[PDB]
Amino acid sequence: LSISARNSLPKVAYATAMDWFIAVCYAFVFSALIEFATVNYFTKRGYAWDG
Amino acid sequence: AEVVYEWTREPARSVVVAEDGSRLNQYDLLGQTVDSGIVQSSTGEYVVMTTHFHLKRKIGYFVIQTYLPCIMTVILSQVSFWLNRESVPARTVFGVTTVLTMTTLSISARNSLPKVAYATAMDWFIAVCYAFVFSALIEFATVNYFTKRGYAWDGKSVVPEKPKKTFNSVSKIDRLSRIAFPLLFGIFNLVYWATYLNR
Amino acid sequence: PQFSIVEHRLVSRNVVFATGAYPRLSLSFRLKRNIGYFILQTYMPSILITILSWVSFWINYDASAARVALGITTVLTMTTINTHLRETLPKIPYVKAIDMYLMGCFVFVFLALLEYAFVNYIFFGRGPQRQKKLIKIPDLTDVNAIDRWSRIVFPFTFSLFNLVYWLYYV
Amino acid sequence: MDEHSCPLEFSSYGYPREEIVYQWKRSSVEVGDTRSWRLYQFSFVGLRNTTEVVKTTSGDYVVMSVYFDLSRRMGYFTIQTYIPCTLIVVLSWVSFWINKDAVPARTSLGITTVLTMTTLSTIARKSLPKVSYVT
Ligand SMILES: *[C@@H]1O[C@H](CO)[C@@H](O[C@@H]2O[C@H](CO)[C@@H](O[C@@H]3O[C@H](CO[C@H]4O[C@H](CO)[C@@H](O)[C@H](O[C@H]5O[C@H](CO)[C@@H](O)[C@H](O)[C@@H]5O)[C@@H]4O)[C@@H](O)[C@H](O[C@H]4O[C@H](CO)[C@@H](O)[C@H](O)[C@@H]4O)[C@@H]3O)[C@H](O)[C@H]2NC(C)=O)[C@H](O)[C@H]1NC(C)=O
Ligand SMILES: CCCCCCCC(=O)OC[C@H](COP(=O)(O)O[C@@H]1[C@H](O)[C@H](O)[C@@H](OP(=O)(O)O)[C@H](OP(=O)(O)O)[C@H]1O)OC(=O)CCCCCCC
Ligand SMILES: *[C@@H]1O[C@H](CO)[C@@H](O[C@@H]2O[C@H](CO)[C@@H](O)[C@H](O)[C@H]2NC(C)=O)[C@H](O)[C@H]1NC(C)=O
Ligand SMILES: CCCCCCCCCC
Ligand SMILES: CCCCCC
Ligand SMILES: CCCCCC
Ligand SMILES: CCCCCC
Ligand SMILES: CCCCCC
Ligand SMILES: [Cl-]
């Protein structure tokens, strides 16, 4: 989405509002993945819960 | 009989190319060969002056953008032979993604060209790389077929031998493939480049 | 929008042809490109994917599917960044600075996937053989030590590569 | 696998048949060396000539037509679409030989085959006009 965000616009040298929105959303996704990595780092036993 | 053309200086010297003025992007102008002659037609005979500019293509762009991703995809597919045979989803991911990437490269290779109906050296190289990747996938499929028990080695166990809880042995197919596939790919690359570069 | 005119220059001279000499005026501009668009478009995804690739070190060796999915996805994203870059450029025969940077990032993620494969081969491949038999580089028996070494080395090597790249091309 | 007969028609714009009449010579249409031609996706089979009279509001005009027969070459499209689709079908077949306990592996294989087949489907029609019938 970030790569294809600005297909039509001229290759300007400043960040637009859409660019900032895309950056913040990607930051949210990256934070979610890092959070999952942190959670998995503290999983002592690798078998799930039985019914 | 009415008009005849000729070259002012000698034919080689009568077609001069400016040194700085070379607008070619992916071609090297080796030289020019000049000639004059005659042509028949329904209206009569005409004196025709011909030049031929000899241009050699530059392989750097294609080596960077098509051949080298193909080689890296082949190596990525061949890396799958080193993981344990019980890593079924992982090795399936290797095979599937490598096949998809090679399909994408095969699709994108033809974009640079006109839609000619014959096969090129790039097409043959992509076909052989696809054959190698698919062969690696089928090799993993056979390894999974011959895999007996679906749980991997615990690590602490003192494995018995091969003539309680049992564990799978390292696949003979994997052991052979680890040295067979890269060797065959390297020999193919050697033969292909030796055939095509020197001509 | 892309360039800035550092300076302009006027020149007057005489150019010689086969017919004869002629007067000649030349009006030159020295354009310098702006890097903000490229930083937003190509680079910043490349670095962020490079940090993404190193998450596989913190995942346990036995969890093979997660690390494999991470490595393969990072390689795929590097490839799609590269192709969406090259789709909009001429067919020049030499490597650009951005191409060199993309190749470096690709090499880094490739080494991440390959060192995961090396850890897997050490554990499951040489494990039973060794058991039946029974900065400095780490010991090649402890997968945890190998993971820690990768954790501390990959960011350092990537930072050094970025440092030399920027200090060379700027 | 299509063969077309593309026409090339010409006539007098202003003068009807009562004023100007066109006629083909004995050597009507001459084709030169047909190997220096730009035709990549098609092959020239032959040509023929015809003459007719077309009714219009202004009057009757003698229209001279030359038809060129062109047969498509399927090598390029065979490389582009047919071979990848068959290879992806075989890739789908490979799921059969996987152990049925490999649930994520087989599911990923099947869905990825579906992805690639959809991608090839949308890519195959890029070179064509947006016609509303099955080829
Ligand atoms: C983009 O790229 C282009 C191409 O490279 C750049 O253009 C070049 O710019 C330079 C200047 O930056 C130009 O150099 C000069 O030429 C002028 C005019 O000279 C002509 O006329 C003279 C008198 O009629 C004649 O003598 C010259 O002949 C040769 O003669 C001299 C002396 O014999 C010889 O030494 C040279 O080899 C000449 O080839 C020529 O026909 C000239 O006035 C300039 O002199 C400067 O330097 C001398 C030092 O010797 C100094 O004393 C002067 O006061 C003056 O400062 C200089 O020689 C060059 O011609 C341009 N080339 C082209 C192809 O246009 C352009 O600059 C780039 N852009 C930018 C933004 O930089
Ligand atoms: C296109 C289709 C092609 C079909 C190819 C079909 C190829 C084919 O038929 O393989 C047969 C077999 C496979 O070897 P493979 O490593 O899987 O051997 C079995 C495997 O090791 C099991 O794990 C063993 O049980 P366990 O874990 O110890 O409990 C079992 O022993 P046991 O149960 O009897 O005790 C073994 O049989 O032998 C070859 O090595 C092939 C060499 C040539 C490979 C060449 C590779 C380049
Ligand atoms: C083009 O049209 C002319 C006129 O219709 C065709 O002329 C005939 O050609 C044959 C073979 O030379 C002759 O035997 C006939 O006598 C010609 N017609 C007349 C009315 O005299 C010519 O063959 C056509 N060329 C083609 C079909 O390629
Ligand atoms: C990519 C760097 C972040 C990886 C997760 C680190 C978790 C550390 C827990 C002590
Ligand atoms: C080209 C495929 C080679 C396979 C070797 C076992
Ligand atoms: C052509 C695939 C061969 C796989 C190893 C037997
Ligand atoms: C496109 C990736 C190339 C990597 C070469 C080291
Ligand atoms: C032998 C492969 C090593 C990968 C980088 C640690
Ligand atoms: Cl060119």
Side-chain angles (χ1 to χ4, degrees):
Chain A
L1 285 157
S2 165
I3 291 280
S4 86
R6 61 214 72 188
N7 285 336
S8 86
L9 313 184
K11 310 191 160 42
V12 293
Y14 46 81
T16 73
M18 211 175 58
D19 300 344
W20 282 113
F21 191 86
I22 294 154
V24 170
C25 285
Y26 182 76
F28 263 86
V29 166
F30 214 80
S31 304
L33 182 39
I34 287 153
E35 178 269 1
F36 161 64
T38 306
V39 167
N40 169 240
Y41 194 80
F42 306 114
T43 318
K44 286 191 165 72
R45 44 195 83 80
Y47 57 85
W49 183 80
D50 65 336
Chain B
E2 289 183 311
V3 173
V4 296
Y5 289 82
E6 202 168 7
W7 295 115
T8 312
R9 297 173 283 286
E10 300 291 358
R13 313 306 314 289
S14 295
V15 170
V16 174
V17 182
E19 199 74 358
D20 63 358
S22 176
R23 283 195 211 175
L24 294 165
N25 290 318
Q26 52 171 349
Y27 286 92
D28 278 307
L29 173 63
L30 308 178
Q32 54 273 3
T33 57
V34 194
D35 191 5
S36 80
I38 45 162
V39 304
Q40 314 302 119
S41 66
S42 163
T43 311
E45 270 161 22
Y46 292 79
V47 173
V48 181
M49 322 287 307
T50 81
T51 316
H52 299 259
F53 305 103
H54 300 283
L55 311 180
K56 188 153 151 285
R57 202 182 278 277
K58 288 182 190 163
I59 203 179
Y61 176 81
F62 304 105
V63 159
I64 293 154
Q65 305 297 351
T66 299
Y67 281 103
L68 183 66
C70 285
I71 285 150
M72 295 296 172
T73 311
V74 167
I75 289 153
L76 175 57
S77 79
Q78 287 166 8
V79 161
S80 179
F81 307 139
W82 300 88
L83 309 188
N84 58 333
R85 66 197 304 167
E86 296 89 330
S87 302
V88 180
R91 293 189 67 167
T92 294
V93 163
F94 272 63
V96 165
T97 55
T98 48
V99 166
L100 264 72
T101 296
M102 200 66 68
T103 301
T104 318
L105 277 296
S106 179
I107 291 281
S108 280
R110 309 293 290 159
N111 293 344
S112 56
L113 290 149
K115 317 199 173 317
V116 305
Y118 44 83
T120 80
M122 185 178 269
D123 284 326
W124 284 121
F125 194 89
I126 290 156
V128 170
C129 287
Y130 206 111
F132 265 81
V133 169
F134 209 72
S135 303
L137 171 53
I138 301 299
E139 190 276 331
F140 156 67
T142 308
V143 165
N144 180 276
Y145 175 80
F146 286 108
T147 289
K148 257 184 162 60
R149 47 193 87 74
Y151 61 93
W153 181 45
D154 59 348
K156 62 183 182 296
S157 283
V158 189
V159 183
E161 209 68 2
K162 190 43 178 172
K164 67 189 174 280
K165 192 159 182 169
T166 61
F167 308 103
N168 283 311
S169 278
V170 176
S171 172
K172 283 186 277 172
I173 310 181
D174 281 8
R175 296 239 289 167
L176 295 169
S177 285
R178 285 158 186 193
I179 58 184
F181 271 76
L183 188 148
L184 278 168
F185 187 55
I187 287 164
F188 163 71
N189 280 346
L190 192 142
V191 168
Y192 170 89
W193 290 119
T195 295
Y196 276 102
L197 281 193
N198 294 334
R199 183 174 295 204
Chain C
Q2 192 83 291
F3 289 93
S4 67
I5 296 140
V6 172
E7 67 185 358
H8 74 277
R9 203 168 287 159
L10 321 179
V11 173
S12 181
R13 74 201 196 82
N14 290 337
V15 72
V16 177
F17 282 112
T19 56
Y22 299 92
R24 178 70 80 78
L25 310 182
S26 301
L27 159 55
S28 311
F29 316 100
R30 181 163 64 151
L31 304 164
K32 192 201 201 309
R33 213 183 294 269
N34 296 337
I35 53 154
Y37 164 75
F38 296 95
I39 286 279
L40 273 158
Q41 197 73 353
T42 312
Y43 285 118
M44 189 204 85
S46 297
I47 301 106
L48 294 174
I49 292 284
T50 313
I51 295 90
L52 172 85
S53 79
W54 305 330
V55 174
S56 80
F57 310 144
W58 271 270
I59 294 157
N60 283 321
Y61 64 93
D62 55 3
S64 49
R67 289 180 86 168
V68 175
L70 176 50
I72 294 283
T73 310
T74 49
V75 167
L76 264 71
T77 310
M78 210 57 34
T79 48
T80 198
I81 285 157
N82 206 324
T83 187
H84 193 287
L85 182 140
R86 81 193 170 247
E87 64 91 10
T88 177
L89 289 173
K91 292 181 164 53
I92 62 170
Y94 43 78
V95 304
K96 308 166 273 280
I98 193 66
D99 276 24
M100 271 285 278
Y101 197 80
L102 289 165
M103 290 205 238
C105 290
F106 177 88
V107 168
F108 269 105
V109 299
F110 206 74
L111 275 296
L113 184 56
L114 266 292
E115 75 85 23
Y116 161 66
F118 197 60
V119 166
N120 190 285
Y121 173 63
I122 289 157
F123 187 81
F124 295 114
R126 293 259 171 178
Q129 203 205 339
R130 286 186 299 92
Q131 195 142 318
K132 173 164 59 50
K133 195 162 183 69
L134 274 76
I135 196 78
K136 79 187 90 173
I137 54 164
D139 186 74
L140 266 63
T141 300
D142 199 0
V143 302
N144 292 350
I146 291 154
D147 280 320
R148 271 190 285 280
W149 171 89
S150 296
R151 281 170 203 177
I152 205 73
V153 165
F154 266 79
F156 176 84
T157 314
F158 193 63
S159 83
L160 177 58
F161 171 77
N162 268 270
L163 194 83
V164 63
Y165 172 84
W166 293 123
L167 295 173
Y168 170 71
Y169 281 112
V170 191
Chain D
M1 290 145 279
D2 53 336
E3 285 158 14
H4 308 290
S5 182
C6 288
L8 177 62
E9 321 165 20
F10 58 91
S11 83
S12 175
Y13 190 76
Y15 302 90
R17 64 183 295 181
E18 290 91 56
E19 292 217 279
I20 284 169
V21 171
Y22 289 95
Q23 202 198 282
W24 282 119
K25 288 180 82 72
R26 58 186 284 193
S27 58
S28 48
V29 176
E30 276 171 339
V31 289
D33 193 338
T34 73
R35 303 261 190 90
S36 65
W37 282 16
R38 309 181 62 195
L39 282 179
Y40 324 106
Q41 288 184 131
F42 282 95
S43 178
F44 178 76
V45 173
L47 56 77
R48 60 207 177 75
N49 59 3
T50 318
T51 189
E52 313 185 340
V53 168
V54 174
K55 314 312 181 323
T56 61
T57 51
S58 46
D60 295 333
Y61 299 81
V62 176
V63 182
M64 308 283 267
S65 311
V66 185
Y67 297 83
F68 311 91
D69 299 322
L70 304 176
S71 194
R72 199 179 274 282
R73 292 179 177 175
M74 71 195 317
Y76 156 73
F77 300 93
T78 294
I79 290 154
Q80 194 92 337
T81 317
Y82 281 102
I83 278 153
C85 286
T86 302
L87 292 160
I88 292 286
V89 168
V90 178
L91 171 61
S92 178
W93 299 346
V94 167
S95 170
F96 304 144
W97 302 89
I98 302 299
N99 198 303
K100 66 190 169 54
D101 298 316
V103 192
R106 296 188 65 169
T107 298
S108 75
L109 177 42
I111 189 67
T112 48
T113 47
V114 170
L115 300 187
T116 300
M117 182 85 48
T118 297
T119 307
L120 292 163
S121 181
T122 179
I123 290 290
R125 297 204 100 256
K126 287 308 207 83
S127 58
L128 278 295
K130 296 183 162 54
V131 295
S132 294
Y133 46 74
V134 168
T135 66

